[PDB]
Amino acid sequence: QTVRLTITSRNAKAVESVTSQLLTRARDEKVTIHGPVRLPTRTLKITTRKTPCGNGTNTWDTFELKIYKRIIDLHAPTEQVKKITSFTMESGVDVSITILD
Amino acid sequence: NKIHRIGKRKGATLKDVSAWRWIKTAARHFKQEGKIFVPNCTEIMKSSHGRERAPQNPDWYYIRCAAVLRAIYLRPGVGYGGLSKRFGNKKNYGSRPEHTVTSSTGPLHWACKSLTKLGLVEPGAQSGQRLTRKGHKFADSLAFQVQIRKFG
């Protein structure tokens, strides 16, 4: 029974300080792992004018938000997986449990 | 010399010959056989609303059906929306910028119906249009004829 581990966050450093921990805890659990895949980084772009009144040279503000996503597929039961995931993550990182068929 | 086999090479298939020659030779074969169904609407209607004039070739439906069959050979499971992209063009909108418009799927629907009646196309399982075994055999055999330079 394959369980899918989806990790996504705004922070590049925090998004893989949990995947490394999830990878390590499962290696201590001896469960076969399909390696953490780095899904494409999606950038949210918002381009607005700098001015609040429409005066002067029309200068613009490019704002970007990057999303980092990883997935780990492991052949482990629900109870064993819950042991792997039962630890404190950092703020701004959410981990999703999914069962594949 | 020009039609001789290169050497250690036998026969031909689709994509091995010129796409225009295959389509021209297929349309000639469709007209000579006479079994293909040609709608009456093709005598007045335009191939697409992106075009501003009706087709100038009296055998434009025969060419379109041959072109559709080759398209189904290259991309099995293709529908009328997919073929509309292949046969689309850029429309003149007057004093306003030109934009790409896909071909009308009506003529492509008629063309797929005519080829289905001929037994050359099978509605693919789980969506799309696919060639039949007779259609695949017809495509390669005609491609060999073009390479041989028979040309009907």
Binding site: T47, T57, T59, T62 | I6, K8, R9, K15, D16
Partner: protein
Amino acid sequence: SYALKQVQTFGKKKTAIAVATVTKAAQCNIKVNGVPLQQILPDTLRAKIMEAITVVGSKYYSRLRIDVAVHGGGQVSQAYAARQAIAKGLIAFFQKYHNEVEKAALKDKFLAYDKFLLIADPRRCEPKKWGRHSARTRFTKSYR
């Protein structure tokens, strides 16, 4: 049985990536996206892809089947990407299955004709900037 002799190379003109699979076969056969060399249009782009053969000679492609799959880019950048993948494939095959005196004469012949036959062009599209219609040109200015 006979061991399989096969290599893979790529070309990188603009956004076009062409991956050529060169293998030992009974008869020479080079196809780009399934289209043979003699069927590639226009004749000017066909002559460019054929340059990956004629600079060294047809004798070096004698028993090689090359399947170039080109994706991305446009018709011209796909031709320059494909002709580089073919030329790099012959060098890679001769490096793997031939001595070094060969494939060094071949490499010199390729580079003496066109450096871009073996080395990818670094040029890439320059981004558009605001207040500009493209990379360089600015908005029209009226002083009265």
